[PDB]
Amino acid sequence: MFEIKKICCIGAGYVGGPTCSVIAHMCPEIRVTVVDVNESRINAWNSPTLPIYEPGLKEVVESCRGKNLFFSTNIDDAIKEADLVFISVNTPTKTYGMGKGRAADLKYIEACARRIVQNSNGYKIVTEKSTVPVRAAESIRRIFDANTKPNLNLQVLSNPEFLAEGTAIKDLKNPDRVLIGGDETPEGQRAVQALCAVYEHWVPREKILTTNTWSSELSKLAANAFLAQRISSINSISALCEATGADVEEVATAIGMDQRIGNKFLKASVGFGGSCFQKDVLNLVYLCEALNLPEVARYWQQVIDMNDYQRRRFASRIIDSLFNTVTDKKIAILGFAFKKDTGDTRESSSIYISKYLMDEGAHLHIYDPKVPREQIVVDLSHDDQVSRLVTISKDPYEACDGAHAVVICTEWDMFKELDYERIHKKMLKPAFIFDGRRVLDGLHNELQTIGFQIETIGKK
Amino acid sequence: HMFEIKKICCIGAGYVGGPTCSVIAHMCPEIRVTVVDVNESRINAWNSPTLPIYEPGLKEVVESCRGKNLFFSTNIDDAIKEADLVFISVNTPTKTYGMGKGRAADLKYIEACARRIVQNSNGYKIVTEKSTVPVRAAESIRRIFDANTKPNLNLQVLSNPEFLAEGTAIKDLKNPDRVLIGGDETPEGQRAVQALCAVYEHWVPREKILTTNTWSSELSKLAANAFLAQRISSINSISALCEATGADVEEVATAIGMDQRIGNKFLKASVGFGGSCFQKDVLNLVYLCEALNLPEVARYWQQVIDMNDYQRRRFASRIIDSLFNTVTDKKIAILGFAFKKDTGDTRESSSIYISKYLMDEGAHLHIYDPKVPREQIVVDLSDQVSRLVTISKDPYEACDGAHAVVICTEWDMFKELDYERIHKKMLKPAFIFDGRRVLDGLHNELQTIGFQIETIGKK
Amino acid sequence: KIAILGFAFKKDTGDTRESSSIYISKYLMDEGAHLHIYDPKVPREQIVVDLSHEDDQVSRLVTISKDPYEACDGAHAVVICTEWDMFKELDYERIHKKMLKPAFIFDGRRVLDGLHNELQTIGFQIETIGKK
Ligand SMILES: O=c1ccn([C@@H]2O[C@H](COP(=O)(O)OP(=O)(O)O[C@H]3OC[C@@H](O)[C@H](O)[C@H]3O)[C@@H](O)[C@H]2O)c(=O)[nH]1
Numbered sequence A: 001m002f003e004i005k006k007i008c009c010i011g012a013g014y015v016g017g018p019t020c021s022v023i024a025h026m027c028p029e030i031r032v033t034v035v036d037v038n039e040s041r042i043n044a045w046n047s048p049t050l051p052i053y054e055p056g057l058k059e060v061v062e063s064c065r066g067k068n069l070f071f072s073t074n075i076d077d078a079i080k081e082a083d084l085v086f087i088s089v090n091t092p093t094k095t096y097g098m099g100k101g102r103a104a105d106l107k108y109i110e111a112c113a114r115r116i117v118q119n120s121n122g123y124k125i126v127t128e129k130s131t132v133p134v135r136a137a138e139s140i141r142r143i144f145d146a147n148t149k150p151n152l153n154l155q156v157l158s159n160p161e162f163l164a165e166g167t168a169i170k171d172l173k174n175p176d177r178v179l180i181g182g183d184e185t186p187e188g189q190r191a192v193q194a195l196c197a198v199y200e201h202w203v204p205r206e207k208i209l210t211t212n213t214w215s216s217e218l219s220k221l222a223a224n225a226f227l228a229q230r231i232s233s234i235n236s237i238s239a240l241c242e243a244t245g246a247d248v249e250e251v252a253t254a255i256g257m258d259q260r261i262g263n264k265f266l267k268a269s270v271g272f273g274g275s276c277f278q279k280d281v282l283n284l285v286y287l288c289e290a291l292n293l294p295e296v297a298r299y300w301q302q303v304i305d306m307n308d309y310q311r312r313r314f315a316s317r318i319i320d321s322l323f324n325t326v327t328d329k330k331i332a333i334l335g336f337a338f339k340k341d342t343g344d345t346r347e348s349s350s351i352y353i354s355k356y357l358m359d360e361g362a363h364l365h366i367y368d369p370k371v372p373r374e375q376i377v378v379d380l381s382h383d384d385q386v387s388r389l390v391t392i393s394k395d396p397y398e399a400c401d402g403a404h405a406v407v408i409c410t411e412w413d414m415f416k417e418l419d420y421e422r423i424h425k426k427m428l429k430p431a432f433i434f435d436g437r438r439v440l441d442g443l444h445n446e447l448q449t450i451g452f453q454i455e456t457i458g459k460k
Numbered sequence B: 001h002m003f004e005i006k007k008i009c010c011i012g013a014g015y016v017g018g019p020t021c022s023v024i025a026h027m028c029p030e031i032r033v034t035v036v037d038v039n040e041s042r043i044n045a046w047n048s049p050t051l052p053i054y055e056p057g058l059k060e061v062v063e064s065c066r067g068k069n070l071f072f073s074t075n076i077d078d079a080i081k082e083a084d085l086v087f088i089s090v091n092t093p094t095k096t097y098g099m100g101k102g103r104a105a106d107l108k109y110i111e112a113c114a115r116r117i118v119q120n121s122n123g124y125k126i127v128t129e130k131s132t133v134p135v136r137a138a139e140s141i142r143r144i145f146d147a148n149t150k151p152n153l154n155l156q157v158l159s160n161p162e163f164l165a166e167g168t169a170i171k172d173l174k175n176p177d178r179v180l181i182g183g184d185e186t187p188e189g190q191r192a193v194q195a196l197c198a199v200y201e202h203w204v205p206r207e208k209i210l211t212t213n214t215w216s217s218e219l220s221k222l223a224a225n226a227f228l229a230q231r232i233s234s235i236n237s238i239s240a241l242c243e244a245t246g247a248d249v250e251e252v253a254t255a256i257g258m259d260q261r262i263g264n265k266f267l268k269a270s271v272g273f274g275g276s277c278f279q280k281d282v283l284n285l286v287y288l289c290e291a292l293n294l295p296e297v298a299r300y301w302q303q304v305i306d307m308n309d310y311q312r313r314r315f316a317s318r319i320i321d322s323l324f325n326t327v328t329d330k331k332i333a334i335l336g337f338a339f340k341k342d343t344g345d346t347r348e349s350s351s352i353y354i355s356k357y358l359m360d361e362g363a364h365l366h367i368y369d370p371k372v373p374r375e376q377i378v379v380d381l382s383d384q385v386s387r388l389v390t391i392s393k394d395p396y397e398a399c400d401g402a403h404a405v406v407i408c409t410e411w412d413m414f415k416e417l418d419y420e421r422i423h424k425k426m427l428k429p430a431f432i433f434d435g436r437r438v439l440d441g442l443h444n445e446l447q448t449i450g451f452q453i454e455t456i457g458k459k
Numbered sequence C: 001k002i003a004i005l006g007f008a009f010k011k012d013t014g015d016t017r018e019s020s021s022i023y024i025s026k027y028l029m030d031e032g033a034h035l036h037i038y039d040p041k042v043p044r045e046q047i048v049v050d051l052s053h054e055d056d057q058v059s060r061l062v063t064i065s066k067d068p069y070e071a072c073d074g075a076h077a078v079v080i081c082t083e084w085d086m087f088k089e090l091d092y093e094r095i096h097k098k099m100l101k102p103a104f105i106f107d108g109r110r111v112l113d114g115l116h117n118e119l120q121t122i123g124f125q126i127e128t129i130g131k132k
């Protein structure tokens, strides 16, 4: 019955931007307007240099922008004319009060809901889309139910986003599934069906799951936690491998060939990062404690404790290899993004490894091909310690020049292609490589012949 | 220089040794396979029309080979003496006293097999440990062999963990996802590994055979089992969250499992996992990690067992609460005692733990299972058994006059029972506690009939 | 089977009060070991009392040997807990022949120092306090 012809998305971030760009790309007859309070971000979306790095994103944006894809700071008018309003904003962790450091702060979701009511008349579908929805649909409904107008009829859906950064475009174009939650009422099902009709322009119907809003959000919270758990599980095995002379990459191969386990997300690492996994597990633990499910809470907390231990163990292996004094020693940090093919650093293990070494007085020279220099400075600041200890290098050979150790924290493909003979000539000896990503496997013989001490996760 | 296996001896005619060697003999008609055991009644059963374990398709495999190239015997000594390859597939029970009591595996039968092999061997032989939970097994065998040499005796030790699941053993053995063989990284070890590979290549493609050293083989099995158990505990933890918030764990599991990085297998919430593999495996992994001064890894994997124990306790207390916290002299039917469907095996079955929680409340249990022998149920539950436990010959007898029906094992026959007939003769309110989600889709009919239906992961 | 050589709390006495041999024996009894205990001066009955809580665990697990070769016959391990001088003069080639293999000597007193090369050549695994 109802056809979505105009879409407004509040939030032009890693979720809203790529998601709306793909919708516009696949649905040429739908006008898609992405809005944001951040004017410089909107200006960048409208420029030759997009505000985030995603493979393939520039091509998608440029094929649609100004045709049926628009980026604007005019939030009010985009809402007023929209058939469907996405809310894709950030929900930062509370920094004080109950749940400090653990529970999500819904203040931006609620501010979006109030702004939608202020600027809406008639019928609209309002859809919360995030990687970590924490009571998001309920809080929007809470606002809408309390702020009615004659003839205003807002429907609330949940539509979690499953994309992973660095593969956003491919993930959005061929999702494993689309998940839409709405009320089990006639109006709720009419709204769900309208959103299904958008996705059916490019997603087969059998890959679209529909449920209620709570089941949708819980499914996302749980699915994220299962993924994070696979990593902590293989990372726990990596510590066991180091202690017993086995190789975690070989053990992972044997594990993953069980088709009931599957062979994905078994790559041991210095530790998982990103704005999703830690926040998701912390909020799951907090929700469980609030529901008086302490056994479930402490079950999932281990996913975070293991990740924290993995990072700490890696840093202390570095410090031990430098014989427990790192004062005034130059150390190259190769990779600051939380994974390859993004400039995003949120919860990157590189931040934590860098801070552990700064606490030892190391002089870090940090190189990453896509993370902006100013972002690294902010991430490592509480300021004076950053001023004394942190240098941001424009190329990796400068970062390694005169270094005692090279620490690979992000699996950028270019790192396996470096001229390690040149790097060794200008390092102080003994020269260490700490591969926190297993990207140098198979170069171990060459690197040892050159003269490096190579240490990697899950192998001793 | 190589070695061709023409005669195989398997010490241990259990759920691992019997089916595995039967499939080997079936797939390798030119290899003589002799399964041996200290247990004479078990050997007699393997040689009879009624096998000592229930595995779908096993009788047909055994009867196609037995007496041609497959033999079952109590003559352990002669089987070893003539063997090219000796499998050790015995049980390693958990220690009941001393260091690691209740947690660490007891290697005494492995060590006795190793000593018996030296005694009865001359010349060259390959000795392969094959179990679902190998815990320092290859190392303990090597230690015995290194210390007990003879002129011209040359024993090689391999690890070859068994990945089969009971109830699907024959299909699993005929089409394994992978075969894992560990051997020494020496010329002798590689010759032994290749010999065992050649056996499996009669029916397993070479790209599915992984070769490594013995410790990496055992650690890979210990970890793989724990990953499987962890999936179950993870979805069971979500089932409690679903019950508390109005969601349905089966729908949540479907949404989770459609992520191809997670996969859609082993996401079936339940009263809790059982079997001789998973709990033993995680306990031994935790104990090993503690011994290696890895307490963070130990407490990480311990949560898999703690969650399973909580899932069982929570299910039992729902039953007791639904019966308003007094079950003294109340008849309760237990449908399913095996640890999963299509086996008669009860080792660590959740049905044991649920039954004991109800017995501690004074319930009169009537237990029905289509394949578990009556005497095993009596042993598993052991005066309190005499007072409280009845073994029913059919499920209608167990439910006659019952307050509650508790489904603990997902036997397919339970979804086809005459539940209108069951309701007529139960006391009211009549409860069904579906600990396996086997009655999904009958919920409307059962409510119309008049049952109170409670199931895991839904409220 | 495990041989316990030495039960007195030090050499040249029959006194067992708070002897380490009691505690080591009890740790091994908790593991189900069959202890065969030899000491040249401690009375048989004192060992029985020291290892009891008429004790059924003592009945099942403890044998008091009249000489050290009987204690070691068929043993997996020889545990020296008291530094009696006679222990370094034993015929360890004869002991090794009748032990099960691998045959361990756990020297809790360092009394076999300097015999280590001879004992390893014979074929023992020798473990001692304060050394690998
Ligand atoms: O009220 C607001 C709040 C926020 N915003 C904008 O919303 C955008 C959010 O983009 P971000 O890059 O910060 O966040 P993401 O797109 O990656 O969201 C993701 O990470 C943050 C998590 O809390 C979310 O669960 C996840 O979906 C920002 O550009 C911000 O300026 C608004 O326009 N209005």
Ligand SMILES: O=c1ccn([C@@H]2O[C@H](COP(=O)(O)OP(=O)(O)O[C@H]3OC[C@@H](O)[C@H](O)[C@H]3O)[C@@H](O)[C@H]2O)c(=O)[nH]1
Pocket: A131, A161, A162, A163, A164, A165, A166, A224, A227, A231, A264, A265, A266, A267, A268, A269, A270, A271, A272, A273, A274, A275, A276, A277, A338, A339, A340
């Ligand atoms: O095997 C692995 C996989 C991933 N990782 C690490 O885990 C972290 C997360 O990586 P992902 O590929 O999942 O990327 P993202 O965090 O952007 O996406 C994740 O959260 C958002 C959800 O919508 C996605 O479905 C989920 O994949 C990264 O730090 C990555 O390097 C490993 O260390 N090992």
Ligand SMILES: O=c1ccn([C@@H]2O[C@H](COP(=O)(O)OP(=O)(O)O[C@H]3OC[C@@H](O)[C@H](O)[C@H]3O)[C@@H](O)[C@H]2O)c(=O)[nH]1
Pocket: B011, B012, B013, B014, B015, B016, B017, B036, B037, B038, B039, B042, B089, B090, B091, B092, B093, B109, B110, B112, B113, B130, B131, B132, B133, B134, B276, B277
């Ligand atoms: O010294 C021995 C010990 C045991 N055995 C026999 O070995 C056989 C083992 O069979 P079981 O049915 O008990 O055990 P499984 O075949 O199922 O082994 C499986 O579960 C037990 C666990 O300890 C193992 O890790 C697992 O592989 C028994 O029939 C037993 O009589 C011997 O012949 N000699």
Ligand SMILES: O=c1ccn([C@@H]2O[C@H](COP(=O)(O)OP(=O)(O)O[C@H]3OC[C@@H](O)[C@H](O)[C@H]3O)[C@@H](O)[C@H]2O)c(=O)[nH]1
Pocket: B132, B162, B163, B164, B165, B166, B167, B225, B228, B232, B265, B266, B267, B268, B269, B270, B272, B273, B274, B275, B276, B277, B278, B339, B340, B341
């Ligand atoms: O989704 C699931 C799957 C399994 N289970 C339960 O988990 C327990 C184990 O079931 P399995 O099918 O794995 O059966 P098994 O214990 O025989 O095999 C397991 O251990 C031995 C290994 O070699 C096998 O690879 C492994 O699957 C059973 O109690 C089963 O009912 C669930 O509760 N949910």
